[PDB]
Design a protein around this ligand. Structure first.
Ligand SMILES: Nc1ncnc2c1ncn2[C@@H]1O[C@H](CCl)[C@@H](O)[C@H]1O
Ligand SMILES: Nc1ncnc2c1ncn2[C@@H]1O[C@H](CCl)[C@@H](O)[C@H]1O
Ligand SMILES: Nc1ncnc2c1ncn2[C@@H]1O[C@H](CCl)[C@@H](O)[C@H]1O
Ligand code: MET
Ligand code: MET
Ligand code: MET
Lengths: 262, 262, 262
């Protein structure tokens, strides 16, 4: 069994590793694979976006244990979700799993109430470790999901709002910068390729209007010059060959962007 | 067997991983779990604080291999310590293990002198890899601790000084900021809750004097507002709900802080 | 089997971990050991330098899967190399493996052409995951190297240029700062000790000329003062005891440096 592990606690001190110690105590045979622990502090949306493509990439016998949990020690509970692939996801019921479940939908869910899957005495400021990680490790060790607490309708899993890309009427699409690919400065939108229907495109945002060609990969434009492309996760992206589209055009996550032909 | 691994060498290049290569060469069956490699360069105190809670969180069959070793290649030796839980700790004898052993005390110790647990030819500027990690991997592979070198009285393990919290006489406690919880800006003191005996508290430091209520977790105060709480490791902490108490009040590690009722 | 994994994609989000998911899907029994994912974006030279000492440190049954692949989705292919130790290396054929193969030379090589070792449909902007990592995992799972595609003469592996240290005639050596040891600010040159033949040395670069003694380790000079030493990888290095030689003298990677006796 594999536990895929994400938090916003950072990798710069022992905290994230104390969770790993707990995993090994409960499930010594579980293989721990970090997703990241560098989610922006308290940023449930950034964390959930990071989780979107994890289900498709990991084996079906994976437990995804993930928390960005500024609600720790409150009425906000942790949930377990079995998705269509056979994976189990454990997380605060705060919208963290919105995109992972869009990608690979939930078939059953449960609320985590049983102390026998918790690390007691649970500390109020770290439910991330003592409820989420603890329960993920019990699932990895073979505890049945239904033994964590009551079933709950898939419909009661909290979701955060997602802005659809909208076709405007002439052929251009008004959408949104979903995230920055921060290592490189590439800009990832929510605009699907099949929504625009070796052509060129007009791209519009508050800062500017530029004409940019479409290519399959960075190297099909000269160093420093821009391209629109289809990114690894199926959506329209903006970049510069071996440069930072973020720094040059100052785009930001959440900025409305409008894209259309010629 | 689990090797829990900490250094100040960073995770930004291959150096920390070359230790992992050495572990796998000596003990292919050992599971490597990083603690962190981002300890501040040369900061034995920060490293040792990071190690304090590792013994309680990890299984008893764990070897804690840890170095912040600006004394590498000198007369400062490496030691092996068996603690009350059955874990083995390997580290420079430079105070790095002060807090881990406060938390879970040493029952026996040894000086590392036998070359058969060293990666020879030992390089003078990296005893961290060639003595500490190498010996940790031999311990993980089954080498007996007594085979590393001479026994030494627990009393000769080097410790760094620790400032006790002092009750002043009226009911307030003069203490010290032990560390900053850097991902979030929470401030961790050495003041125990049972030392202050839903109340409010006066907190005093050089920068300021403010009145702050006590709660069990961040979410019991509105976003942006301060709380005193009991942190996950048993000590009094200062934070802001989804904010940085460090940045707002400018507190620092090592600052004397005084806290008392109403 | 061990997969040693390097990229320039960063560890701050899920991308590097999606490769790990793919590894576990193809080779669940493979142990994944990160080298680093913090190579500077697009910096093939920095990545290859990081890989130089990996072959010697890792077991012979290691697959080194490494990519800094700004050529992804282009005619630049991925290669498999068996080196003298029995390890397999998988990487873009773009010079990334120059130094790893200097250190432990290639005995056979192959071009990766067979789709049966690729993660199809390969995405054009991430050959790093879908060709390099995918093929590394198949090798770890037992696929034979010759089954990846056509053999190629070791001579056709792309290399990047390396500047030799040159003895100038009087006894001083003109060389080059190969890399900065970034955690600490130590300066690593390409000058061999046996090329200079408890003495003192004159060190010359554009910024300055200073006299610096030679010692085996940092602690043999007082805190804050400079030393020339032999670093862990066999070359002449410049540092300050518990300080940053980079910040004090402003040296940089690629700066010509000249060193000689008295
Ligand atoms: N000052 C603070 N205010 C609100 N939430 C905080 C916090 N410090 C840590 N957490 C939150 O504690 C969780 C562990 Cl359960 C992390 O996920 C973090 O999001
Ligand atoms: N310029 C320098 N001065 C003093 N100590 C140094 C150093 N560079 C690395 N180390 C020290 O070398 C150790 C590996 Cl044995 C690290 O733990 C580091 O603390
Ligand atoms: N805007 C960009 N321009 C050129 N190359 C880029 C890029 N963004 C990512 N990569 C390159 O994509 C690889 C994955 Cl195959 C990484 O190794 C990276 O070097
Ligand atoms: C930017 S890293 C290269 C691959 C990335 N997944 C993309 O499609 O933009
Ligand atoms: C600040 S991260 C949340 C948990 C942490 N251990 C604390 O008690 O402050
Ligand atoms: C600078 S980290 C200490 C060891 C390093 N490998 C060196 O020789 O400079």
């Amino acid at each position: 069994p594999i536990i895929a592990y994400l938090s916003d606690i950072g990798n710069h001190d022992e905290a994230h590793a104390l969770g790993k110690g707990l995993i090994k105590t409960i499930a010594p045979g579980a293989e721990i694979v970090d997703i990241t622990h560098q989610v922006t502090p308290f940023d449930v949306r950034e964390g959930g976006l990071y989780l979107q493509d994890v289900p498709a990439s990991f084996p079906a016998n994976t437990v995804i244990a993930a928390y960005v949990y500024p609600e720790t020690g409150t009425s906000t509970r942790t949930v377990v979700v079995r998705n269509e692939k056979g994976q189990l996801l454990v997380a605060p019921n705060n919208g963290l799993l919105t995109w992972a479940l869009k990608a690979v939908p939930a078939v059953e869910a449960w609320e985590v109430t049983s102390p026998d899957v918790m690390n007691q005495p649970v500390t109020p400021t770290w439910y991330g470790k003592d409820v989420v990680v603890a329960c993920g490790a019990h699932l990895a060790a073979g505890v049945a999901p239904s033994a964590v607490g009551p079933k709950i309708d898939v419909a009661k899993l909290v979701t955060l709002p997602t802005t659809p890309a909208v076709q405007l009427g002439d052929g251009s699409v008004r959408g949104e910068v979903v995230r920055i690919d921060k290592a490189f400065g590439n800009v990832w939108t929510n605009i699907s390729l099949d929504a625009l229907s070796g052509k060129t495109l007009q791209v519009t945002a508050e800062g500017l209007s530029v004409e940019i060609p479409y290519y399959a990969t960075f190297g099909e434009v000269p160093i420093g010059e821009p391209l629109v492309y289809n990114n690894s996760r199926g959506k329209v992206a903006l970049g510069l060959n071996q440069g930072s589209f973020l720094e040059r055009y100052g785009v930001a996550a959440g900025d409305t962007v409008t894209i259309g032909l010629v």
